[PDB]
Amino acid sequence: VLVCPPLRSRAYTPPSDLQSRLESHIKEVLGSSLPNNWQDISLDDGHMKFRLLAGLADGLGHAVPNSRLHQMCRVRDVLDFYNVPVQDKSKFDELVASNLPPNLKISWSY
Amino acid sequence: AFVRLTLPPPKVVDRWNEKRALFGVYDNIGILGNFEKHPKELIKGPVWLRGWRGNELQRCVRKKKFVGNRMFIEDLHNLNKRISYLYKHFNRHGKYR
Amino acid sequence: GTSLDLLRSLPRVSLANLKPSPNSRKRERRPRDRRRGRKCGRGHKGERQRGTRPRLGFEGGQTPFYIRIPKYGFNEGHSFRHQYQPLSLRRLQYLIDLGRVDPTQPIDLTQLVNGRGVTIQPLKRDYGVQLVEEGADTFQAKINIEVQLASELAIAAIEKNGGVVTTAFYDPRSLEILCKPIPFFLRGQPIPKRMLPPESLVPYYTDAKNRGYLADPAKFPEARLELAMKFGYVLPDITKDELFRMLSARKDPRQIFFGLAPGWVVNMADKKILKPTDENLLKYYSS
Amino acid sequence: NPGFVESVDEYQFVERLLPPTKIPEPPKHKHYPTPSGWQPPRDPLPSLPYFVRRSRMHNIPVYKEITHGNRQMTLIRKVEGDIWALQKDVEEFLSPLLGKTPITQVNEVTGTLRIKGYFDEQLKAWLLEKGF
Amino acid sequence: DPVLRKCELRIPVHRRPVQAWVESLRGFEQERIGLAELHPDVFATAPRLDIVHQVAIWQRNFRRISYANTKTRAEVSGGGRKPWQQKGSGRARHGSIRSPLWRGGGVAHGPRGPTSYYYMLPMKVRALGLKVALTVKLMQDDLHIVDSLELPTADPQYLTELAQYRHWGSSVLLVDLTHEEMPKNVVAATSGLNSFNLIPAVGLNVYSMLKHQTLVLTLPSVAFLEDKLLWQDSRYTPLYPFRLPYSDFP
Amino acid sequence: YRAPPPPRRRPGPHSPDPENLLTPRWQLTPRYVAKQFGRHGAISGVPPASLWPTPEQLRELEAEEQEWYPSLATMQESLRLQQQALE
Ligand SMILES: [Mg+2]
Ligand SMILES: [Mg+2]
Ligand SMILES: [Mg+2]
Ligand SMILES: [Mg+2]
Ligand SMILES: [Mg+2]
Ligand SMILES: [Mg+2]
Ligand SMILES: [Mg+2]
Numbered sequence: 023v024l025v026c027p028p029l030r031s032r033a034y035t036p037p038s039d040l041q042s043r044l045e046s047h048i049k050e051v052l053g054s055s056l057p058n059n060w061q062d063i064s065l066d067d068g069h070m071k072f073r074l075l076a077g078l079a080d081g082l083g084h085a086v087p088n089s090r091l092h093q094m095c096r097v098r099d100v101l102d103f104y105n106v107p108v109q110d111k112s113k114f115d116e117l118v119a120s121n122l123p124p125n126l127k128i129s130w131s132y
Numbered sequence: 133a134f135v136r137l138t139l140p141p142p143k144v145v146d147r148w149n150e151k152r153a154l155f156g157v158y159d160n161i162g163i164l165g166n167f168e169k170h171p172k173e174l175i176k177g178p179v180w181l182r183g184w185r186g187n188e189l190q191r192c193v194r195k196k197k198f199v200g201n202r203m204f205i206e207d208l209h210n211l212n213k214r215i216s217y218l219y220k221h222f223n224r225h226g227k228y229r
Numbered sequence: 230g231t232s233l234d235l236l237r238s239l240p241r242v243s244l245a246n247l248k249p250s251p252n253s254r255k256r257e258r259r260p261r262d263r264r265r266g267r268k269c270g271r272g273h274k275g276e277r278q279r280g281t282r283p284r285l286g287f288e289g290g291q292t293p294f295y296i297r298i299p300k301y302g303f304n305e306g307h308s309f310r311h312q313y314q315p316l317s318l319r320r321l322q323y324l325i326d327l328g329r330v331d332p333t334q335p336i337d338l339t340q341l342v343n344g345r346g347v348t349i350q351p352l353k354r355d356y357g358v359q360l361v362e363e364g365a366d367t368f369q370a371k372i373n374i375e376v377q378l379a380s381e382l383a384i385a386a387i388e389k390n391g392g393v394v395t396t397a398f399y400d401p402r403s404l405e406i407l408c409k410p411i412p413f414f415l416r417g418q419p420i421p422k423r424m425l426p427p428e429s430l431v432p433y434y435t436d437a438k439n440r441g442y443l444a445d446p447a448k449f450p451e452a453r454l455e456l457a458m459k460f461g462y463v464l465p466d467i468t469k470d471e472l473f474r475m476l477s478a479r480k481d482p483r484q485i486f487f488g489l490a491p492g493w494v495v496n497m498a499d500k501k502i503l504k505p506t507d508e509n510l511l512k513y514y515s516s
Numbered sequence: 517n518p519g520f521v522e523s524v525d526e527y528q529f530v531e532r533l534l535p536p537t538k539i540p541e542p543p544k545h546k547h548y549p550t551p552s553g554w555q556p557p558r559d560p561l562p563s564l565p566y567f568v569r570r571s572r573m574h575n576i577p578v579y580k581e582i583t584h585g586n587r588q589m590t591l592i593r594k595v596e597g598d599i600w601a602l603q604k605d606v607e608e609f610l611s612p613l614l615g616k617t618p619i620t621q622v623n624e625v626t627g628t629l630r631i632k633g634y635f636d637e638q639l640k641a642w643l644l645e646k647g648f
Numbered sequence: 649d650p651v652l653r654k655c656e657l658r659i660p661v662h663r664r665p666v667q668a669w670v671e672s673l674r675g676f677e678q679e680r681i682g683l684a685e686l687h688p689d690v691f692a693t694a695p696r697l698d699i700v701h702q703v704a705i706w707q708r709n710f711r712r713i714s715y716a717n718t719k720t721r722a723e724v725s726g727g728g729r730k731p732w733q734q735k736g737s738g739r740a741r742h743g744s745i746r747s748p749l750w751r752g753g754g755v756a757h758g759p760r761g762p763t764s765y766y767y768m769l770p771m772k773v774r775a776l777g778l779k780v781a782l783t784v785k786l787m788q789d790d791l792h793i794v795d796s797l798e799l800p801t802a803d804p805q806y807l808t809e810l811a812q813y814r815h816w817g818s819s820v821l822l823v824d825l826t827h828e829e830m831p832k833n834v835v836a837a838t839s840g841l842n843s844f845n846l847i848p849a850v851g852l853n854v855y856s857m858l859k860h861q862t863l864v865l866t867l868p869s870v871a872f873l874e875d876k877l878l879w880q881d882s883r884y885t886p887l888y889p890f891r892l893p894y895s896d897f898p
Numbered sequence: 899y900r901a902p903p904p905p906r907r908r909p910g911p912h913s914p915d916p917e918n919l920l921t922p923r924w925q926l927t928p929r930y931v932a933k934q935f936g937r938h939g940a941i942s943g944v945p946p947a948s949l950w951p952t953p954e955q956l957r958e959l960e961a962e963e964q965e966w967y968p969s970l971a972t973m974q975e976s977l978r979l980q981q982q983a984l985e
Contacts (some may be wrong), residue, residue, distance in 0.1 A: 026809040072650040072683040089787045091667040148842040150899050156707045156855035157901050165850045167890035177713035181764040225280045236695050237787045244858050250698035326550040328543040343535035369551050410533040417932030431973045488529030498939030503520045505950050519947030534895035827903045847901045
């Protein structure tokens with residue numbers, strides 16, 4: 023009886039404490055107590071990358087797209103990728119909530 | 133002129149039927165299959181123009197070569213006349229010399 | 230890359246979005262518009278406009294130019310002239326440099342074609358490969374090359390560096406099998422004998438200076454020495470060279486391939502070679 | 517008595533006749549350039565933004581081209597990276613010799629650079645120095 | 649246990665291999681279980697949509713044979729005798745009642761016989777099209793790499809529900825290494841579903857990928873495709889038809 | 899949908915039935931028989947002795963060779979006479 027879990031949202035907002043999560047995650051993955059210049063550390067090792075990126079995805083809830091996976095050469099690239107937000111609101115949704123002038127009215131038929 | 137006084141029935145096409153869904157599969161049978169079969173071998177058509185293309189005069193002569201001896205008398209007669217017409221056109225007429 | 234990054238942002242690629250490369254196609258002009266209709270590009274009423282103008286080379290009725298010039302034998306006998314796809318020493322050295330020819334092994338027409346060094350068309354009267362003098366100076370390689378035709382200066386380059394050059398005749402049937410061995414083995418027919426050169430080529434391939442395969446072995450030393458003096462180099466001692474057996478290797482005059490005798494059969498599927506035990510056939514093949 | 521006798525010892529001579537379907541990797545040489553003139557790509561690789569890859573025959577992809585019978589051009593084919601940097605470098609290199617900026621085309625989709633006139637020899641050496 | 653795949657062949661030093669998230673269809677939440685390294689020259693070639701156009705049109709035309717035909721003025725029954733004399737009747741001059749100007753006559757320039765539109769692009773060109781199509785799916789996050797196609801149940805509903813959960817497109821193309829070894833569970837499910845079309849590795853084509861939104865590739869099939877396409881470059885020109893014995897070709 | 903199994907060329911040796919009148923004639927000549935041996939070796943079933951020419955066939959080849967392809971000595975002997983005549 024495999025029951026499909028409820029569909030997840032495809033919008034992501036960077037947490038304020040993202041830095042704390044990332045530094046803790048790096049320490050847990052390798053156990054070096056965050057050596058200085060941690061961001062510069064590369065992800066060349068296959069196992070290293072999988073443990074780090076997969077762990078962040080489980081907690082944060084967003085995973086690196088396959089297209090952007092290769093460009094995650096260093097931890098800094100991984101950190102930057104999570105920082106940028108992801109919005110599921112369509113450009114129409116912005117118009118609806120933009121508080122347009124009264125003379126402008128929009129009705130959605132879809 | 134005159135035009136229809138009513139709209140014709142709607143034409144509905146099922147784009148996910150078996151023939152359309154699998155269209156194109158095995159077109160790379162050769163390069164991905166160690167060149168066992170050339171893709172031309174997958175074409176379904178007249179025996180004399182499977183994996184071949186030519187102009188009508190060449191097409192006429194090629195139809196005769198493969199099935200010239202298995203054709204009906206009237207069909208063969210028309211083919212012979214069709215060849216002779218095309219021959220004089222392509223070899224004796226046209227703007228360019 | 231950066232260009233690849235743009236594709237990620239753009240919408241999904243689908244059958245609707247397909248576009249031909251810029252300027253790849255042309256507009257096909259049809260006769261339905263004023264510029265291209267009406268008289269439809271054929272001028273006024275006349276023979277050329279009716280579609281029935283005379284044949285090419287017809288100059289109105291005077292004797293045509295092509296028929297009024299004397300017949301001469303420029304092209305007489307062309308289909309029976311012998312063609313040798315030339316090979317220069319630059320191409321030879323260039324091929325050896327890139328590892329597309331194995332200098333340690335003996336060289337022949339099969340190993341030239343296998344390494345795509347040369348392209349041969351037996352159906353177009355090719356009778357082999359002629360070595361050419363171009364690139365002798367840059368040639369500093371020792372190799373045992375078999376080529377149907379050789380030149381004086383080309384021989385010097387091979388000999389000076391300490392190599393063996395020999396000239397052998399392959400008849401039209403032999404050449405086809407030599408350039409393209411595998412299919413012949415697939416046919417299932419036995420390997421054929423190699424016929425001797427016709428009378429016209431007999432003097433060449435029996436001449437010592439030309440390094441003919443049928444030439445007398447005794448006269449080679451003297452001929453090589455005379456060439457060595459002419460081009461100002463001292464003959465190297467091949468015998469002392471470690472690979473004397475390989476360099477000296479020469480196939481039998483009736484052999485297409487070094488290691489295969491006439492009349493044998495090759496079974497690629499079973500990985501075996503079959504040799505006839507019949508005395509009558511052996512007599513014929515041995516000849 | 518069988519009419520044929522089968523021997524497997526000599527079958528090696530047929531393995532020699534089999535041709536290859538691949539272009540062999542060039543053999544290592546003690547001293548470069550080889551007598552023909554071929555030189556392998558330099559090591560370590562150049563650090564420039566653009567990389568020019570070699571052809572399957574291990575040669576620099578620079579070709580003399582011609583159209584209409586009198587338009588002489590030379591084209592670099594297997595360009596990679598930022599092609600625009602390559603154009604600027606070539607423009608400086610060829611300007612002093614001609615005395616003018618060469619007329620060039622950049623085909624970003626095809627990744628090629630086209631130059632009017634025949635400069636195959638000059639560009640091949642110029643690309644050789646960079647180690648592409 | 650991270651399932652890690654690396655290229656069996658030699659990648660160019662300057663290029664860096666692309667990577668993908670290995671997935672398993674066994675579980676709904678088994679989104680990521682391993683990491684893969686995809687050969688750059690297969691999955692990172694320059695983006696060119698003219699080659700996709702070239703191959704896509706090829707996969708349309710060479711097969712095409714049209715059976716439209718129209719009789720000419722000679723094949724039309726009758727029309728042997730001249731209808732009337734040239735002069736004396738006050739009508740235009742006609743030599744047969746079956747002419748292109750006559751009702752019931754023969755067509756002037758119509759379709760004649762069966763016609764063929766057969767042509768083949770060069771071997772490298774069509775192989776290059778496959779490489780281009782592979783990258784386009786990868787970059788647009790339409791390609792999912794899976795270890796095996798094994799599924800918990802044969803029920804088609806599970807497969808459709810899983811696609812929505814993982815955000816795959818409506819139409820999914822599934823590629824397995826060989827037709828004979830494909831799991832029975834997938835066979836039952838995909839057959840009942842129109843959009844989910846299952847093909848073997850050897851049957852990969854550009855047109856199928858363009859029609860199908862997402863593409864699911866098994867790990868062995870990726871290796872199979874990587875070797876086949878990368879063989880097309882670094883190869884000689886065929887001395888023979890390739891099927892014949894070759895020194896270094898399977 | 900699941901696609902049909904990939905098209906395959908029939909493996910192994912192939913022997914048509916001579917009785918059928920539509921079987922192509924070239925598929926029945928002795929030349930076609932040798933092709934079967936080369937492709938599949940022993941499994942073809944072709945009598946290996948048959949590959950070599952038969953004694954009557956052997957005489958055919960030998961008779962032709964003498965007629966058109968002379969021996970080495972004869973070529974050299976004729977060439978000397980021609981030079982003497984020209985000389
Ligand atoms: Mg037209
Ligand atoms: Mg007159
Ligand atoms: Mg040639
Ligand atoms: Mg009639
Ligand atoms: Mg009449
Ligand atoms: Mg009339
Ligand atoms: Mg009609």
